[PDB]
Structure formats: C-alpha cells, structure tokens
C-alpha cells in the first residue's frame, strides 16, 4: 500500500535526504524473511489511519533481504542492531534516535508513535 522509494546504499540514502530536505522522512528497513516486516505490511501500513498520517512524509525503504555488502554497509552506517527497524529524519535531515521503531507496532500504536515523533 505505501509508496516507498527504494534506496540501496549509503550514498543513495544521502542523496535522497538531500532531495527531501524541507520535508520529513521515514526509512523502513525491510527483509523478506523478517516476520515483523510482513506484519507491518499486513496490519499497520495497510491501515488508512497510518497511510493518511504519512501522506506528507517522504517514504524510503531499504530491502536488506540478501544481506549483501551494500546492505551490510548501510546497516553499519545507520548503527542498526537488527530488523525490524524504522528510522525517521526531520525536515532538516536530522535523525532523532528516540523515534526509531525496533519492534512490531499495530496501527494505533504506530500512529501514536508518529504523533509523538
């Protein structure tokens, strides 16, 4: 349902953040094998409340399924401990670590998180 822009590398993330500057950003770290990622798609990203709450946010996604060298370098640079992980950047491109989501959240919980981020 959500319309994500895929990014693969650190450099691609940086250029996406340059281009997004002035608008907030969400970066979803995805893998086909991560059950929580599939649960986000099923329960959370499918919910209109969440979709509408994100309508004015730039949505980026990295698909780290393969755990290839670029995937690994991206996760390292973001200091990601494992999946699921969703990061947020404000309209200046700054990441606030308290806004990271590192477990499943249902639509109500995720929407409240957004509201608080």
């Amino acid at each position: 349902h959500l319309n994500f822009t895929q990014i693969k590398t650190v450099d691609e993330l940086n250029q996406a953040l340059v281009e997004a500057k002035g608008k907030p950003v969400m970066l979803d770290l995805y893998a086909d094998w991560c059950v929580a990622c599939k649960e986000f798609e099923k329960y959370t990203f499918s919910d209109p409340q969440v979709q509408k709450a994100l309508a004015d946010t730039v949505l980026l996604q990295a698909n780290v399924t393969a755990n290839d060298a670029q995937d690994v370098a991206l996760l390292k640079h973001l200091n990601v401990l494992g999946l699921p992980t969703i990061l947020f950047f404000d309209g200046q491109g700054q990441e606030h670590p308290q806004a990271r989501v590192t477990g499943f959240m249902d639509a109500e919980t995720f929407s409240a998180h957004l509201r608080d981020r």
Side-chain angles (χ1 to χ4, degrees), residues 101-117:
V101 174
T102 55
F104 174 76
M105 293 181 172
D106 70 7
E108 174 182 279
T109 301
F110 190 65
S111 295
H113 183 84
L114 296 176
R115 176 170 40 259
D116 292 337
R117 117 251 192 198

Side-chain angles (χ1 to χ4, degrees), residues 25-76:
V25 179
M26 180 177 96
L27 171 61
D28 184 64
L29 304 179
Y30 171 88
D32 289 331
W33 43 254
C34 180
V35 171
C37 293
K38 300 314 283 179
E39 294 177 325
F40 271 104
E41 288 174 345
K42 183 180 178 66
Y43 298 115
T44 306
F45 298 166
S46 58
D47 195 310
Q49 175 181 191
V50 170
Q51 296 168 348
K52 292 179 174 315
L54 290 173
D56 288 348
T57 300
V58 175
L59 306 185
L60 305 181
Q61 185 170 61
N63 172 16
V64 300
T65 297
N67 206 231
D68 67 30
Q70 286 167 153
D71 300 332
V72 171
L74 178 66
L75 297 166
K76 299 280 194 89

Side-chain angles (χ1 to χ4, degrees), residues 69-106:
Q70 286 167 153
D71 300 332
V72 171
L74 178 66
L75 297 166
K76 299 280 194 89
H77 177 79
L78 296 171
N79 203 1
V80 171
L81 296 329
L83 269 63
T85 294
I86 309 174
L87 308 194
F88 298 89
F89 306 79
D90 65 20
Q92 302 287 355
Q94 295 267 347
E95 196 237 325
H96 303 99
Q98 181 69 229
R100 291 186 179 202
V101 174
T102 55
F104 174 76
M105 293 181 172
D106 70 7

